Structure formats: structure tokens, C-alpha cells
Ligand binder design. Structure first.
Ligand SMILES: Cc1cc2nc3c(=O)[nH]c(=O)nc-3n(C[C@H](O)[C@H](O)[C@H](O)COP(=O)(O)OP(=O)(O)OC[C@H]3O[C@@H](n4cnc5c(N)ncnc54)[C@H](O)[C@@H]3O)c2cc1C
Ligand SMILES: CC(C)=CCC/C(C)=C/CC/C(C)=C/CC/C(C)=C/CC/C(C)=C/CC/C(C)=C/CC/C(C)=C/CC1=C(C)C(=O)c2ccccc2C1=O
Ligand code: SF4
Ligand code: F3S
Ligand code: FES
Lengths: 577, 130, 119, 243
């Protein structure tokens, strides 16, 4: 164990924890901030975002409009005070990004343009071409360079945080390249490890998204909340599940069946529209889950088109003719012809719905602080409660930036009061981070992790997806239960010590193996339906605010079980309607 | 110690010989050898056309020699290649903006060529006709 | 690691020349090879428009004096600069190269500038 | 149907064990959608758990999965087995030093990416104030030079770099140029000093192979020339400078 002292320690470097570095870095110039991440910061998932960050900006807009949009969007499950605050800071924070010189796309007058996204009335999505998340992350990552206060621990996979007497005291990590562990001591830790989607078979999430952060959190008695709302994107390339952005639908895309009948005209999405007039809230820019539901509806009807990729529908764009595209729709094009062989003018891109975002997360109060004093979480790995039951397109990057600075600050501050904990216990707790990891390495037993991985992911996909039924969730718990047992029986071939991904991969599979268990019970218990979680069993097919207006809290326990608790949803000026 | 042994590859002189794009790169560059020799011929020319007509006729004799004449066409080939290649690169250092997009090479290349076309003649009419 | 403060190379001089070099050797050089290299001694040129008598006229007269300087010179700089580099690009150690070539590139600018001022 | 089989050659190299990289042969199942990344996966997944290598986004956006395929620089990410039926040799991205298997130490890359100060310098305005203004026009000036994903492929195509490792490389200069050309910046002085050095833009013989391999169509080499034209304008002003 080589140790290092540090004022604060940030796990992860995509959007949020990147912005958190920056923040802490200026709340206090003399601070020693350590930014850990398992990959150079710039390849974090936040690169792949396309749509944009939400931020109230038009003159005819209004924070009430954006506030009310967000609540109803999520179905009241959002904590309103948190939402309130979120809405009111997005415009500062996007400006500041434009101040650090991120290339937002513009209007002939040199001011900032907006786009339609996520089913709101008054548009407010700021965007840098079709490439928004890349411009953000890349723009935060260079900006951070001008501050020596931030010392990056790059390619350093983080094993466990340190905890004692109700408080955080540090973390442990492996230098990937070197094969050894430092132990970083700090008295605040912002957890911003980002996403849980890769625990599904099909999805849009890059390889790094495996739940690391949320896992470590469970192991310290901290709960995951709203863990069963998983959000699905309507248009996923078959197989890869690569994202086709809503944008193209919004620029004139079609979605059609084997008969190419434009089918979302009868799932209460119709009055059809003209090729030219695509209209908000209707047919192809109709309501999120609606579109996804019509796939399943049209899937169950023998109507989807069968490929080796899997069943599909078709989104048509062939009817836009260049110039339309290349100005506003270029990557999508390159995507099409690459990953499936379809040139956006002569045939149609096969798209099926696919797994996308984790509305769930580590419980946090309004400042991003967990029940463990000094521990914060920010970003998609966390549950401040902006999204409640269903994220709104474009609000997610907005989050990173907005709450990642507040996490940045608050963290800082907390770190300036901690007083010292027991410098004996903690050491002996990092101590056990080593012993523990080791009891993993020698495991003799022989399971290819790899099968467990394919097997979980599939389980997730079948019994915890768009349309959910008891009988099936029950399968998924039972599966997981089993995978869980079986992981204790997988032996790890590479005993090598340098960039040994055989190991790191396994460690991460173990974690999702815990987030998973933790979204299936959440779900099977939510006998009602909301935003993204829809069951068909008789009795629980409507939204119930009499007894289902609360956040689900899942807690892995020490004896290995998953246990629930329901806390209430905070209301202010918009009662359930 | 570390358990790492960062292996570094050899970068030979046969390097350019491998890829057919480096091969071609080296070429454009050899284009200079002849381009200088021709500058030397020209000089001899300058000094013979001064040692007096007896000599300048012997310069021309050297130019009559078959050898010198393969070599000299080859000189023309280099040149022509350089002229082609060169025109396609200069453009790539001008960063101009038309309508509201940033323009491409297609257009300058065209004039750099017209200007060659015209000079080539306006010069051949001068040394040959007037 | 990446040396904080670095020394401002002086290459924007040979390069600058070389620019002029390449552009001239690119519009005007093919045509003249044609004349002096082929047309002239292949006798394929009308009457007596390319014979001691006439050539000397031009050579001797100013704008034909300025002309042969540039036609000799630039193509020298240009190509010399390129074979300089072209040396390294091939991993060949040339003792004092910078002076050799641009050295030679000056000597010969002198010889030429001489011929041109004398007659 | 019934699915084809390709036979991949991937170059393995261990520090702890081997003394030099060496070849290896894997047989991979495949269809018309199978990518190099995809196969790399199939391998570790069921015949060689020991292979390690870099990847994440899966859609040629993140910039981790670059390597060499038959001497050409590429993204595993976006390379399909269908285009390599007569054979396929995969080495670690050239011009960088192999640490292990298909992963190579990219610190020079970063160190350089850093050195040229890739951030807006000296622009006072603050949020309460609003964004700065910048026209679809101004934007255009540096736009393309902003699509770099730090993938490192240009660095594995420019011999000038593989002949001189102190050279800050295409990307680096490009990135810099981008901030330099961006109407809202004020740190051009702050950035030239590198650029004007010998391992700055003047280490470029304009081979052009970097612009040829860029997966995000940035054209690094147009950026470097512009560099030159600017270095050179800088050298002149400073020859009129001694003051
Ligand atoms: C294809 C795609 C398109 C999208 N488009 C949009 C859009 O248009 N608009 C919008 O608002 N949202 C969009 N999103 C969602 C949104 O971008 C993400 O939800 C958000 O970026 C989450 O990023 P993050 O900052 O919280 O952290 P992440 O970006 O996921 O980064 C986490 C970081 O932590 C590191 N890390 C993880 N675990 C460990 C560990 N154990 N040890 C050390 N380091 C670790 C890694 C990485 O560097 C999209 C998502 C995908 C996948
Ligand atoms: C504005 C414009 C268009 C012009 C301004 C005037 C200028 C600078 C005009 C260029 C002069 C011109 C048209 C020259 C054509 C070239 C000629 C007559 C070349 C003759 C010529 C020949 C044929 C040799 O063999 C030879 C051998 C050894 C040394 C020198 C020579 C030499 O000069
Ligand atoms: S310029 Fe292109 S090739 Fe080079 S690192 Fe950037 S994206 Fe890669
Ligand atoms: S290939 Fe190399 S020589 Fe210059 S043009 Fe690109 S950096
Ligand atoms: S894995 Fe992202 S560039 Fe290919």
C-alpha cells in the first residue's frame, strides 16, 4: 500500500466528476484534489451524447414551464425542491461552458440556438452539432488542465472507499498499468463513476459502464434508490444497440412495419402527419414509452421484420435527400452504413428499442451528500431525484454540469471540517481491501466469468424491460440469485500483473451482479406502474399515487440479501395530477 | 522494480519502402534532384553563352547527346510531377470562408493550373514566334 | 518531459525561400525544360529565334537578366532544402548539413548572380 | 444459415514473460457485421482470457480502440472482418511503445496534448454577463479542428514522429491551432513558443498520411500548414522585434 493525502478525492472523470474537480479547484485554490478514473478522462461515456443539454434560454420560455415539464415528465416522482434548483441553474452552467469555449452550434446572429427535445412545448436544448456530449467532455477536460490543483490518477481502477465512525476517510485503487495499489486518503469523496446500463444484454452504453460506484456504495450500507426505473431508447441499431438519435426522427424520420404502414397512428398517436410536417407529441415524435410500447404491440402482432440481428421496425429517412441531412444529420449517416450496411438514401435502417439510462442511483440529499457524512455522489451513478420515474431527454448532461459543481463545492467544504478519524481503524480497513481482493485472485473453481456476464445481461433484458410481469421478474431474481452464487466459483486466468483486464473485468461483473439484484427486487415490489416501469399483471397496471408515491430504497445487506425501504416524495407547488 | 518491460520498435531506413503511400511520398521528394541539375545545366548555359559562340555551340552539342536527352525528359517528368503534387498542397494552407462554409481545395487547384496553362503559352510564343 | 521553454527554430527562413522556390519551379519550369531541354537542340523551333545571336539578346537584356537569375536560383533553394531533409528522412548522417546545402545554395546563388551581372 | 470462420493473427507481447512481442493465431467466427473489436472480444472471451486491450464506446467516438491492421493504423472499433478475407495481422498502434499486448503507453501524446495549453486564455467575461457572441461564420474558422478524439492514429502514421519522438505530433498542433483560431481565445502568445520550436510545426515534412487516416475527418495536416504560415508570420514580427 503506497498512500497519498489529498484534500478531496473524485472517483471518475466524464462530465460530472470532471466538473466537480474544477469546482473544488476554485472554491479553494490551495486544495490538493485527486481525480481518479480507470480510463483517460476523455474516453468517458459522456462523449457519446448527441442531443444536448437542456437549459432555459428562450425569451418565451420560463423556469415554471421547465419545472412543470420535468415533474410531470417523471410522473411526480421527482423531489421538487431538488428540481426547482436544477431548473434554475442550468443556464448559468451552460453559459459557463460556452465561456470555457465549448463550441455550441449558433444562430446567424452569433447567439446560442436551441432544439426540440424530450417532449417539451417550449424548446430549450442547447447543442454543439450532433456531437454535444463530446464537445462537453472534451471541453471540461482541457479546461481542468489549467489548474494544477487537480492531480489526475488516470487508469486507476478504484476498489473500495474507506469508512469509519459514520465518515469517509479515503479510498483504495489499483494503478492498472503498474499492477499495484495506492490508497488515497481524503475526507470527502465525490462518487461520479457514472452509469449502470451495461448490466443489460442490449443497450447504448459503452464498455466502462458497469455500476462500480453504485456497488461500493451498497457495501457500506448506503442505499440505491429508484433503482427499478430503467429507461429505454426507441431507436437502437440491432445487435450493438447503438444509438440512432431522436434528432433524426425530429428532422423528418419515419417508423414503419413489414407493410411500412406508418404504425404509431393507432396507439393513441394519431392523427397521421405529412412527410414534411413532423409535429411534437404526435405519431413519430410521439411520447417516449409509447413509441417503445408500440414496438412490442407491433412486435406481438407478427408485424416487426426479422433479421439475424433480431426483430425490428424501420425508421425511414430516405425521403429527406441529402442537404437536409448533412447539415444537421451527418454522423448518423456514417453510423448506418458502418454498423449495419445502410446508406441513409437507398434502404431503411433497422432499429429496435434498446436500453439506455439509469434513473436510479445512490441516495443523496439536495447537496449530493449520502447518509455517510463526507460521501457524495453525482451524475448518472447518483439519485438526487431530478428524474423521479423517467428522465427527460436533454436533462441528463444538464445534470452533470449543474450538480457536479454543487457537489464540487459541498464536498470541498465538508472536507474542511471533518476532524480526524481514527487513523488506526481506517488503515486496517484499507488493510482489508487488500486481503479481500486477494481472496478473489486465488479463487480455484472455473467458471468463465464471460458466461455469467452473457447470462445476467440476458436475464435482465427478458424479465426487467419495457413491459413487466410478475412471473417473469421472479425469474430474473431467481436467475441473478444463481449467478450470484456461481460467481463465488469463477477462477481468473491471468495471474499477470500489468494491465490485467481479465481481473478488472471480473471485479466489475461482480458489481453489476449487485446492481441487478437490486433493480429486480425494486421492481417486483412496485405493484403499480410509473413512467418507465409498466406491469400487466391484473391490479397493477395503473399509476397509483395512493400507495405508490414513494422512492424505493434498496440495501444490500452484510448477509448478502437485498432489502427494501420506502421514503416519501417531497412536494412543493405541483400536487399529483 | 516494475514488472513492466516497455518494448520499443526499430524504425529502419527501409521505412518508406514499406507503404505505397510513403513510396510515393519519397518520390515527390526525389523530384528535387533533377530540379537542381537542370538549374546546373542552365548555369553552364549561362557561362557558355558568354565564353563566346564557339562554346555555346558545344553546350548545344552536349544537349544533342542522346544520354543527356533521356535524362532531360526525365527532368521534365519530375517537374510535371512536382507541379501536379505541389498544386494540390498549397491550397491546404489557406483557410478561406465563402457563403458561410469554409472552402475547399477544388477551386484553387483550378487556377494554379490555369495560370500554368497560360504562362506555358505566353512563354512559348515569346521564345518561338515573335 | 516536454521542456517548458523551447528554442524558436530558425526554419521559417529556408522554408520561406523554398515556398517561392516550389511555386516558381511549378508554373514556369516545365515549359523551359521543353525549350532548353528538348526544343532547342532538337532543332524544332521556327527560323533563327533560338540561336546564339537571339538568346544572347534576351540574356543580355535586363528582364531576361532578372529572369535567368530567378529561374536558376529558386529552383536551387527549393530542391536543396528538400534533399536536406530528404537526407534525414532516410537516416543518413551528413556532417554539418545545414551549412553544406544552404551553403552550396549560396555559393551557387553567387556564381549565378555573377554571370548575370557580367553579361 | 451457417457462419464463416476468419483466422486472425494478433501480436502478443508480455513484459513479465516474453522478451519480444510475438505472433499468435486465433480463429474467429464471423458475419457481415463483425468488427475487429468484436473479434478481439470473442478471443478473450473464449480462447484467450489473457489478451488485454483498450475499448469503450463501440461506435468510433471515444478514441480508445486504435491499433494496427496489416500495417495500417485503425480503430478495432470500426474495422470489419469482411474486408480481410485473404488475411489479417493486428499489431499494437505503431510509433508508441508496447506495454502489453495491444495496449501502448500514450503518455507523450498526453504530455503534448497538455503542453500547448488547450484552453481559452484571457477572456474576461463571466456568466452573469451572458455567453460571448460568435457567428456561424467565426465558428467555421476552427470548427473541423475540434473533432479530434485523441485516438492517436495520426501519431502512428507520421514517420516524422517515428524518427523524432520529441516532436509534439499532428493532433497536438491541431488541437492547439483550434484554440488559436477560435475567436474567443486570447492566449496565442501563450501557445506559439512551442509551435515555433524544431519539435513544434517545423518537424513536419508534409507527408500527409495523418490526414489520410483520421477517423473523424479533421485533416491534421491542413492544421499544421496553417501552423507554419503562422509560425513564420511570428518569426518575421520578431525579426522586427528585438526592440
Ligand atoms: C449513446 C448515448 C447517447 C446519449 N445522449 C444524450 C443527450 O443527447 N443528452 C443528454 O442529456 N444525455 C445523453 N446521454 C446520457 C448522459 O450523457 C449520461 O447519462 C451522462 O453522461 C453520465 O455521465 P457521467 O458524467 O455521470 O459520468 P460517465 O460519463 O459515465 O463517466 C464515469 C467515469 O468514471 C470512471 N469510473 C467508473 N467506474 C470506476 C471505478 N470503479 N474506478 C475508477 N474510475 C471508474 C469511468 C469514467 O471516466 C447519452 C448516453 C449514451 C450512452
Ligand atoms: C506581367 C507579365 C505576364 C510579364 C512581365 C515581363 C516578364 C518578367 C516576362 C518573362 C520573359 C519571358 C516571357 C521569357 C520566355 C523565355 C526565353 C526567351 C528563354 C530562353 C533561353 C533558352 C532557349 C536557352 O536555351 C538558355 C540556355 C542557357 C541559359 C539561358 C537560356 C534562355 O534564356
Ligand atoms: S487528429 Fe484524427 S487521427 Fe489524430 S488523434 Fe485526432 S482523431 Fe485521431
Ligand atoms: S503525416 Fe506527418 S509529416 Fe506532417 S503532414 Fe502529417 S504530421
Ligand atoms: S471503442 Fe470507442 S473508438 Fe472504438
Amino acid at each position: 500500500m503506497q498512500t497519498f493525502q489529498a484534500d478531496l478525492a473524485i472517483v471518475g472523470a466524464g462530465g460530472a466528476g470532471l466538473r466537480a474537480a474544477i469546482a473544488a479547484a476554485q472554491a479553494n485554490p490551495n486544495a490538493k484534489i485527486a481525480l481518479i478514473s480507470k480510463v483517460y478522462p476523455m474516453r468517458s461515456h459522456t462523449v457519446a451524447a448527441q442531443g444536448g443539454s437542456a437549459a432555459v434560454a428562450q425569451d418565451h420560455d420560463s423556469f415554471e414551464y421547465h419545472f412543470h415539464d420535468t415533474v410531470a415528465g417523471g410522473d411526480w416522482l421527482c423531489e421538487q425542491d431538488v428540481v426547482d434548483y436544477f431548473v434554475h441553474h442550468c443556464p448559468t452552467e451552460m453559459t459557463q461552458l460556452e465561456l470555457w469555449g465549448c463550441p455550441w452550434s449558433r444562430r446567424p446572429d452569433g447567439s446560442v440556438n436551441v432544439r426540440r427535445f424530450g417532449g417539451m412545448k417550449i424548446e430549450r436544448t442547447w447543442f454543439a452539432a450532433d456531437k454535444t456530449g463530446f464537445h462537453m467532455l472534451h471541453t471540461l477536460f482541457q479546461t481542468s488542465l489549467q489548474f494544477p490543483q487537480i492531480q489526475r490518477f488516470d487508469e486507476h481502477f478504484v476498489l473500495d472507499i474507506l469508512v469509519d465512525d459514520g465518515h469517509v476517510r479515503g479510498l483504495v485503487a489499483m494503478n492498472m498499468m503498474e499492477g499495484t495499489l495506492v490508497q488515497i486518503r481524503a475526507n470527502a469523496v465525490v462518487m461520479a463513476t457514472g452509469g449502470a446500463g451495461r448490466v443489460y444484454r442490449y443497450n447504448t452504453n459503452g464498455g466502462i459502464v458497469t455500476g462500480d460506484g453504485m456497488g461500493m456504495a451498497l457495501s457500506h450500507g448506503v442505499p440505491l434508490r429508484d433503482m427499478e426505473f430503467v429507461q429505454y431508447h426507441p431507436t437502437g441499431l440491432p445487435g450493438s444497440g447503438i444509438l440512432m438519435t431522436e434528432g433524426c426522427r425530429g428532422e423528418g424520420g419515419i417508423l414503419v412495419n413489414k407493410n411500412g404502414y406508418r404504425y404509431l397512428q393507432d396507439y393513441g398517436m394519431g392523427p397521421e402527419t405529412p412527410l414534411g410536417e413532423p409535429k411534437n407529441k404526435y405519431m413519430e415524435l410521439g411520447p417516449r414509452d409509447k413509441v417503445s410500447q408500440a414496438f412490442w404491440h407491433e412486435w406481438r402482432k407478427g408485424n416487426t421484420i426479422s433479421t439475424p440481428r433480431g426483430d425490428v421496425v424501420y425508421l425511414d429517412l430516405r425521403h429527406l435527400g441529402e442537404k437536409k441531412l448533412h447539415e444537421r444529420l451527418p454522423f448518423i449517416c456514417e453510423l448506418a452504413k458502418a454498423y449495419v450496411g445502410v446508406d441513409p438514401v437507398k434502404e431503411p435502417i433497422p432499429v429496435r428499442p434498446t436500453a439506455h439510462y439509469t434513473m436510479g442511483g445512490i441516495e443523496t440529499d439536495q447537496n449530493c451528500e449520502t447518509r455517510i457524512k463526507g460521501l457524495f455522489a453525482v451524475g448518472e451513478c447518483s439519485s438526487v431525484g431530478l428524474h423521479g420515474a423517467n428522465r427527460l431527454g436533454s436533462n441528463s448532461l444538464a445534470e452533470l454540469v449543474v450538480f457536479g459543481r454543487l457537489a464540487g463545492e459541498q464536498a470541498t467544504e465538508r472536507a474542511a471540517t471533518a476532524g480526524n478519524g481514527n487513523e488506526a481503524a481506517i488503515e486496517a480497513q484499507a488493510a482489508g481491501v487488500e486481503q479481500r481482493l486477494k481472496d478473489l485472485v486465488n479463487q480455484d473453481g472455473g467458471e468463465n466469468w464471460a458466461k455469467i456476464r452473457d447470462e445476467m445481461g440476458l436475464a435482465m433484458e427478458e424479465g426487467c424491460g419495457i413491459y413487466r410481469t410478475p412471473e417473469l421478474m421472479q425469474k430474473t431474481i431467481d436467475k441473478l440469485a444463481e449467478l450470484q452464487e456461481r460467481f463465488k466459483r469463477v477462477r481468473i486466468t491471468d495471474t499477470s500483473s500489468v494491465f490485467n483486464t481479465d481481473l478488472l473485468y471480473t471485479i466489475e461483473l461482480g458489481h453489476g451482479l449487485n446492481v441487478a439484484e437490486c433493480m429486480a427486487h425494486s421492481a417486483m415490489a412496485r405493484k403499480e406502474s410509473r413512467g418507465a416501469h409498466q406491469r400487466l399483471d391484473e391490479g397493477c397496471t395503473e399509476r397509483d399515487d395512493v400507495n405508490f408515491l414513494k422512492h424505493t430504497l434498496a440495501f444490500r445487506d452484510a448477509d448478502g440479501t437485498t432489502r427494501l425501504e420506502y421514503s416519501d416524495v417531497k412536494i412543493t407547488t405541483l400536487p399529483p395530477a | 522494480t516494475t514488472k513492466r518491460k516497455p518494448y520499443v520498435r526499430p524504425m529502419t531506413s527501409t521505412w518508406w519502402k514499406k507503404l505505397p503511400f510513403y513510396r510515393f511520398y519519397m518520390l515527390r521528394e526525389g523530384t528535387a534532384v533533377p530540379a537542381v541539375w537542370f538549374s546546373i545545366e542552365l548555369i553552364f548555359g549561362l557561362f557558355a553563352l558568354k565564353n563566346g559562340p564557339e562554346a555555346w555551340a558545344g553546350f548545344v552539342d552536349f544537349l544533342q547527346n542522346p544520354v543527356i536527352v533521356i535524362i532531360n525528359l526525365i527532368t521534365l517528368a519530375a517537374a510535371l510531377l512536382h507541379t501536379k503534387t505541389w498544386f494540390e498542397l498549397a491550397p491546404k494552407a489557406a483557410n478561406i470562408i465563402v457563403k458561410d462554409e469554409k472552402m475547399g481545395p477544388e477551386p484553387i487547384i483550378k487556377s494554379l493550373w490555369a495560370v500554368t496553362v497560360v504562362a506555358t503559352i505566353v512563354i512559348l510564343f515569346v521564345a518561338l514566334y515573335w | 518531459m516536454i521542456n517548458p521553454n523551447p528554442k524558436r527554430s530558425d526554419e521559417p527562413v529556408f522554408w520561406g525561400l523554398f515556398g517561392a522556390g516550389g511555386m516558381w519551379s511549378a508554373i514556369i519550369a516545365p515549359v523551359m525544360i521543353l525549350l532548353v531541354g528538348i526544343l532547342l537542340p532538337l532543332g524544332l523551333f521556327p527560323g533563327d529565334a533560338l540561336s546564339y545571336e537571339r538568346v544572347l539578346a534576351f540574356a543580355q537584356s535586363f528582364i531576361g537578366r532578372v529572369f535567368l537569375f530567378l529561374m536558376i536560383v529558386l529552383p536551387l533553394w527549393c530542391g536543396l532544402h528538400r534533399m536536406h531533409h530528404a537526407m534525414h528522412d532516410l537516416k543518413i548522417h551528413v556532417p554539418a548539413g545545414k551549412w553544406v546545402f544552404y551553403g552550396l545554395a549560396a555559393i551557387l546563388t553567387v556564381v549565378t548572380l555573377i554571370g548575370v551581372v557580367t553579361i | 444459415a451457417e457462419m464463416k470462420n476468419l483466422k486472425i493473427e494478433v501480436v502478443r507481447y508480455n513484459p513479465e514473460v516474453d522478451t519480444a512481442p510475438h505472433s499468435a493465431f486465433y480463429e474467429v467466427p464471423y458475419d457481415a457485421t463483425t468488427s475487429l473489436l468484436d473479434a478481439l472480444g470473442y478471443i478473450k472471451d473464449n480462447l484467450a482470457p489473457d489478451l488485454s486491450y483498450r475499448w469503450s464506446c463501440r461506435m468510433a467516438i471515444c478514441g480508445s480502440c486504435g491499433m494496427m491492421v496489416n500495417n495500417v493504423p485503425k480503430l478495432a472499433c470500426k474495422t470489419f472482418l469482411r474486408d480481410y478475407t485473404d488475411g489479417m495481422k493486428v499489431e499494437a498502434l505503431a510509433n508508441f511503445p508496447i506495454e502489453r499486448d495491444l495496449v501502448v503507453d500514450m503518455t507523450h501524446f498526453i504530455e503534448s496534448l497538455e503542453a500547448i495549453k488547450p484552453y481559452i486564455i484571457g477572456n474576461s467575461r463571466t456568466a452573469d454577463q451572458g455567453t460571448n457572441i460568435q457567428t456561424p461564420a467565426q465558428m467555421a474558422k476552427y470548427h473541423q479542428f475540434s473533432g479530434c478524439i485523441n485516438c492517436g492514429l495520426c501519431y502512428a502514421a507520421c514517420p516524422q514522429f517515428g524518427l523524432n519522438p520529441e516532436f509534439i505530433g499532428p493532433a497536438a498542433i491541431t488541437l492547439a491551432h483550434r484554440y488559436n483560431e477560435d475567436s474567443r481565445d486570447h492566449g496565442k502568445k501563450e501557445r506559439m513558443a512551442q509551435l515555433n520550436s524544431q519539435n513544434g510545426v517545423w518537424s513536419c515534412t508534409f507527408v500527409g498520411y495523418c490526414s489520410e487516416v483520421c477517423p473523424k475527418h479533421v485533416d491534421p495536416a491542413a492544421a499544421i500548414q496553417q501552423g507554419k504560415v503562422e509560425s513564420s508570420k511570428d518569426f518575421l514580427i520578431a525579426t522586427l522585434k528585438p526592440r
